[PDB]
Amino acid sequence: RAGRKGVDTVGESILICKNSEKSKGIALLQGSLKPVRSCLQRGEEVTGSMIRAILEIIVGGVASTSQDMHTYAACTFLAASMGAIEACVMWLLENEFIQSTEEGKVYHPTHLGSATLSSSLSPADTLDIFADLQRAMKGFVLENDLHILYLVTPMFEDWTTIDWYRFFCLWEKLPTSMKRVAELVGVEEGFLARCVKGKVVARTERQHRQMAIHKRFFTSLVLLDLISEVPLREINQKYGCNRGQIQSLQQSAAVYAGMITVFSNRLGWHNMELLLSQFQKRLTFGIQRELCDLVRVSLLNAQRARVLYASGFHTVADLARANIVEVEVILKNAVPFKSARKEAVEERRNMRTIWVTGRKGLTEREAAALIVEEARMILQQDL
Amino acid sequence: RAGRKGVDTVGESILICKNSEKSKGIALLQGSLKPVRSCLQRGEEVTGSMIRAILEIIVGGVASTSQDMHTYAACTFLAASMGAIEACVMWLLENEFIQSTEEGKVYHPTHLGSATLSSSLSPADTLDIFADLQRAMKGFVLENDLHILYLVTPMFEDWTTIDWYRFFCLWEKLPTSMKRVAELVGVEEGFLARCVKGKVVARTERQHRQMAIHKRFFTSLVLLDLISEVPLREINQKYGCNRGQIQSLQQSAAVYAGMITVFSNRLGWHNMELLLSQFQKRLTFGIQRELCDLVRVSLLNAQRARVLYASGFHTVADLARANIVEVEVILKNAVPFKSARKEAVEERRNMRTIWVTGRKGLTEREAAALIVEEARMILQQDL
Ligand SMILES: [K+]
Ligand SMILES: [K+]
């Protein structure tokens, strides 16, 4: 990124080092990129990338027989550099992903197969997800939205560094209704104590998904406050994570929530599907059910939707009838100031202070007129 | 109680009244006792006293036929003043208390019958107790002693006036292990809130044993601290009850615990019997399992047993080897003073400061020698 084309004569790069790390710095300047691996490499005859690859072609209906499988193996990048394929096919058979009809040896997708493909889910993750859902449908808590959120809470990657001492403090202060959900999932208070007392991550044993469970329940709490319209600064102080890690999490959970919804629909689990089908939109914007209609407008996010709701505008229909200058004023009240704000400067009438995507700078007035204009266009398309 | 025989010339009685309650006072001075009712009186064809009376003679084996029943009815105080009997017999039949073998119409006791008699329990109470035990054996908490105590916690009479606001404060501070026991029993947090917020006793509906449940769980908490050797003053401040109400409760629960143990033994419920059979002794003295051996000595109560345990004397065997003057000193340390106690007065060497039952005043020295003497006599009887 050193050197602007058409602007600079040269691009300069400086790597600051010490005498001790002097040799490692030179290694980088002379270093070159490593050769590209296939990521489908084989004491592991089976592998995730291959299992998914084989599942996609069989369920999709472009690979039926055993001859089609090895023909596919020829097209891979792994074979370009110049058994394992057969192992993945059996794996799909053992775990009810694929069917075999002896037309000798022809493979067809199951309901679980077609569901996994439509859900864009990884076959390795689908097994635990399928069990987790069946476990939840045997005993489910409906008095709050926490248990539902847990099912759509992603835990395939760490989104933040969790302070366990902070976690235990929230555990005790946690209401009884949410402790019931914790117990029902696997959250044991004993494991939480062995985390604060001693910084033993363990996780060496495969059976230590016990760690992931507590990380997942911690995350669901964050997502619970998030769709409860709890301020980002409160969530930051309460949990110990920045706004960057949160936004990356909600956009991840919004997508994941859609996956579990599709997965539940293709298996015929209507009751479970019915509950989940409202959280994709709520996780995206971080809102409650009431603001779901307002946030259809492009410029209206969580903060702008709430202040317009609390001012009499509950729906797009109510927002189309709106007086523009009234919308503008309500927007002006949602701004965050360090001092308890909420002189006359008439030189700020042209200040473009509202950002969009692929944006021209919008004034607070122009944005308001756009919100009312868009609301009317949507109101007509609703008929 | 006015007038000491052989001492006073007269006994004087004065009833202090106002002008408003003047007439009611005269009513007492001229009043006389009401005639004695039978307490087995009959829109109530069946009655508790009769059901129990009929059960006792059939199970005991002194009344078999229908002729024996009405012969018994003649001996009652109710018939002395000069149908319902037949109704009680059917009730015992409907609720598996008694058997009928058509030798036309001969009645025999069931296992449930013989158990109720041996337990000294009321047939009306036995039905709910029998259900409560069967409910507990389906899901039982063993990590603490609370759930076991609930089964031997008596609630046939009020032993104190419970402050519900205080109760809710202990509810929130209550650990998760004891909240699980509350939920498992029937303690709903919603009902606790409707007690503090509004002083609605209700209890007009028969189905409002929901009140008794919360009163019973409140009581079990008191009994839990009591056998955990928590000081009487702490229990007084924590719950809001005096030491008189507590002592009346523990002697009531000690007896009741023995009843439920016998009841469980006659039904063949060994596992349940095994757990309960240790709480009669602990409820009596208000001690933990360790002091169970020491309290066999007559003079050793909860307080004296603990200070002797913490000083090296764990058993009667260890207490028989004891040096008398050492026991005396340990006893002197258990005394409660307002100031942080624990001059030389050698005039208190004859002060009788220890009370017994059917008592001569005992000195702290004489009592110690009695404790060691009794311990030796018990140690020999143990062989
Ligand atoms: K929007
Ligand atoms: K004793």
Angle subtended by helix axes B164-172 and B189-196, to nearest 10: 140
Q: How far is the CA of B237 from the centre of ligand 2 (A)?
A: 26
Tokens 């603490």 label which residue? B144
A327-335: long-range contacts at Cβ-Cβ below 8 A with a sequence spacing of 24 or more? A327/A368, A327/A371, A327/A372, A328/A364, A328/A365, A328/A367, A328/A368, A331/A304, A331/A307, A331/A364, A331/A367, A331/A368, A332/A364, A333/A307, A334/A303, A334/A304, A334/A306, A334/A307
Which run of H or E residues covers position B274?
helix B270-276
A179 touches chain B (CB under 8 A): yes
Number of residues written out for chain B: 383
Work out the minimum CA distance from A205 to partner chain B, whole angstroms: 28
**Measured between alpha carbons, how far is B180 from B186 in angstroms, rounded to an integer?**
10
For every residue of A2-38, DSSP letters joined together read ---TTT-S---------STTHHHHHHHHH--PPPPP-
Q: In chain A, what residues touch B180 (CB-CB under 8 Å)?
A: 183
For testing the chain A interface, which of B168, B171, B176, B179 should be mutated: the one with the most A CBs within 10 Å?
B176
Q: How far is the CA of A234 from the centre of ligand 2 (A)?
A: 59
Q: Which ligand is nearest to the CA of A304?
A: 1
Closest residue on chain B to A174 (Cα): B172
B176 touches chain A (CB under 8 A): yes
Q: Which ligand is nearest to the CA of A286?
A: 1
Strands A106-109 and A98-101: what pairing? Answer: antiparallel
User: For A36, left (φ over 0), alpha (ψ -120 to 50), or beta?
Assistant: beta
The count of CB pairs under 8 A between chains A and B is 7
Q: In chain B, what residues touch A183 (CB-CB under 8 Å)?
A: 180
Q: Which ligand is nearest to the CA of A284?
A: 1
Structure letter (DSSP) for residue A266: H
Q: In chain B, what residues touch A179 (CB-CB under 8 Å)?
A: 176, 179
Work out the minimum CA distance from A214 to partner chain B, whole angstroms: 17
B179 touches chain A (CB under 8 A): yes
B143 touches chain A (CB under 8 A): no
Q: In chain B, what residues touch A170 (CB-CB under 8 Å)?
A: none
**Measured between alpha carbons, how far is B334 from B294 in angstroms, rounded to an integer?**
16
8 Å CB contact between A300 and A294: yes
B144 touches chain A (CB under 8 A): no
B296 touches chain A (CB under 8 A): no
Closest residue on chain A to B173 (Cα): A172
**Measured between alpha carbons, how far is A284 from A282 in angstroms, rounded to an integer?**
5
8 Å CB contact between B185 and B174: no
Work out the minimum CA distance from A150 to partner chain B, whole angstroms: 21
CB contact under 8 A, B189 and A176: yes
Q: Which two tokens stand for residue A330?
A: 């309500």
Q: In chain A, what residues touch B183 (CB-CB under 8 Å)?
A: 180
Secondary structure E strands in chain B: 98-101, 106-109
B216 touches chain A (CB under 8 A): no
Work out the minimum CA distance from B24 to partner chain A, whole angstroms: 54
Resolution in A: 2.9
Instruction: Report the half-sphere exposure of A289 (CA within 13 A, side-chain side).
Output: 5
Work out the minimum CA distance from A162 to partner chain B, whole angstroms: 23
A382 touches chain B (CB under 8 A): no
Q: A179: helix, coil or strand?
A: helix
Q: How far is the CA of B258 from the centre of ligand 2 (A)?
A: 18
A189 touches chain B (CB under 8 A): yes
Q: In chain A, which ranges are continuous DSSP H helix?
A: 22-30, 48-59, 66-75, 84-94, 111-118, 123-136, 146-151, 164-172, 176-185, 189-196, 210-226, 232-239, 243-266, 270-276, 279-285, 302-309, 316-320, 324-332, 364-381
Closest residue on chain A to B178 (Cα): A176
Q: Which two tokens stand for residue B90?
A: 């059917």
Q: Which two tokens stand for residue A206?
A: 């495969």
B168 touches chain A (CB under 8 A): no
Q: How far is the CA of A368 from the centre of ligand 1 (A)?
A: 14
In degrees rounded to 5, what are phi and psi of residue B107? -105, 130
Q: B237: helix, coil or strand?
A: helix
Work out the minimum CA distance from B51 to partner chain A, whole angstroms: 43
Closest residue on chain B to A179 (Cα): B176
Query: Rounded to 5 degrees, what angle do the CA atoms B106, B108, B111 make?
Result: 160
Work out the minimum CA distance from A187 to partner chain B, whole angstroms: 12
Closest residue on chain A to B189 (Cα): A176
Q: In chain B, what residues touch A189 (CB-CB under 8 Å)?
A: 176
Give the C-alpha distances (Å, rounded to integers) separating A61 from A58, A111, A117, A179, A330.
5, 14, 11, 46, 55
Q: How far is the CA of A292 from the centre of ligand 1 (A)?
A: 10
Number of residues written out for chain A: 383
Q: How far is the CA of A260 from the centre of ligand 1 (A)?
A: 23
Structure letter (DSSP) for residue B362: B
**Measured between alpha carbons, how far is B270 from B276 in angstroms, rounded to an integer?**
10
CB contact under 8 A, A189 and B179: no
Considering only CA atoms, which of B278, B243, B246 is closest in space to residue B260?
B278
B189 touches chain A (CB under 8 A): yes
Considering only CA atoms, which of A361, A299, A358 is closest in space to residue A334?
A299
A44-52: long-range contacts at Cβ-Cβ below 8 A with a sequence spacing of 24 or more? A45/A83, A45/A84, A45/A87, A46/A84, A46/A87, A46/A88, A46/A91, A47/A84, A47/A88, A48/A122, A48/A123, A48/A124, A50/A84, A50/A85, A50/A88, A51/A88, A51/A91, A51/A92, A51/A123, A51/A124, A52/A122, A52/A123, A52/A124
Give the C-alpha distances (Å, rounded to integers) separating A149 from A137, A152, A211, A281.
14, 5, 18, 13
Work out the minimum CA distance from A299 to partner chain B, whole angstroms: 42
Q: Which two tokens stand for residue B220?
A: 């079990």
Q: Which ligand is nearest to the CA of B302?
A: 2
Q: How far is the CA of A287 from the centre of ligand 1 (A)?
A: 11
Q: In chain A, what residues touch B176 (CB-CB under 8 Å)?
A: 179, 189
Tokens 């799909």 label which residue? A92
Work out the minimum CA distance from A124 to partner chain B, whole angstroms: 35
Tokens 């999490």 label which residue? A249
Q: How far is the CA of B323 from the centre of ligand 2 (A)?
A: 20
In degrees rounded to 5, what are phi and psi of residue A109? -75, 145
8 Å CB contact between B356 and B297: no
Q: How far is the CA of A298 from the centre of ligand 1 (A)?
A: 4
**Measured between alpha carbons, how far is A234 from A241 in angstroms, rounded to an integer?**
10
